[PDB]
Design a binder for this molecule. Sequence first.
Ligand SMILES: CC(C)(C)c1ccc(CSCC(=O)NCc2cn(CC(=O)O)nn2)cc1
Length: 321
Amino acid sequence: CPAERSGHVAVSDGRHMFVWGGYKSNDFYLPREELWIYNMETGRWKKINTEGDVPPSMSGSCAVCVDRVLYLFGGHHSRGNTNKFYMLDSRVLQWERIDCQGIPPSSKDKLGVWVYKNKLIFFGGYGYLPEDVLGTFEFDETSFWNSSHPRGWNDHVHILDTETFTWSQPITTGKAPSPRAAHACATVGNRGFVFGGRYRDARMNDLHYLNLDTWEWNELIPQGICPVGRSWHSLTPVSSDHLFLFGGFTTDKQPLSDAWTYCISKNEWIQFNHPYTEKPRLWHTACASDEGEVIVFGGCANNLLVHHRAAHSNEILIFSV
Ligand SMILES: CC(C)(C)c1ccc(CSCC(=O)NCc2cn(CC(=O)O)nn2)cc1
């Protein structure tokens, strides 16, 4: 039922997948008030129209679902990037914009988030120069000609404490990943993994994790064959020991349909064979089910940067991992 889209968000409790936002070609954004719910057990869709402080229609936003409470940060609306923070209690649904304390992150999109205890921990993204902070920001030289305000990538780590809805920045040790956007984040225990992403002229192949207890960065160097570097991929925990990688976009502008699992305990990648080899996706979403499956929705089958030829999808791809 839902219309095709890329750059949407999809979050889940393992049974119901909530889809919001994104854009398509016919860069018209999809209706801001619509919240699509996909039942992973029955395969049925349901649309509900939300009220309250409905966020602007956006692509590249960052969302999480914790105890059936939906949190949304950042994104790109018709007038640029944002750093607003929204909440939707899904337990008539009403959005609520939270006026957080502390210094918020810079306005940006295409980032990632880890969830650990009371903390939402955001990393990276693409957006405007920080108006103020810890980390590094690198301008995208091409942004000075295609836009009113220039933009760049960051390697910032920001915590939102949901106990007080206060922003802060942790003091991290170790070598942080370079600034990036369109990377993929995944959390298992107190480890926030990040893989790939776009930085300058490369879509990268490196894998790191941030210890969310000690705030120490670690680079992971798996031995043997590793997936090609990419952006606009998904990285989804499917167990306490495996992360599922699917899709994305290479430095060479190749849409990707390969799937892998990263085994955390063995520190190796395992390529996953599946029936969607002719169905590459970039800027899709991926959500894990309680039954071990990974549910991919939306995204684009070809180079979405050629807008007038972009092949956005509304297909559900089910990976039984
Ligand atoms: C309007 C139209 C539909 C044509 C459209 C335009 C632009 C975009 C995004 S491109 C601009 C940008 O924000 N560049 C920084 C960036 C990119 N990436 C991902 C990667 O390049 O792999 N990570 N950081 C998408 C659609």
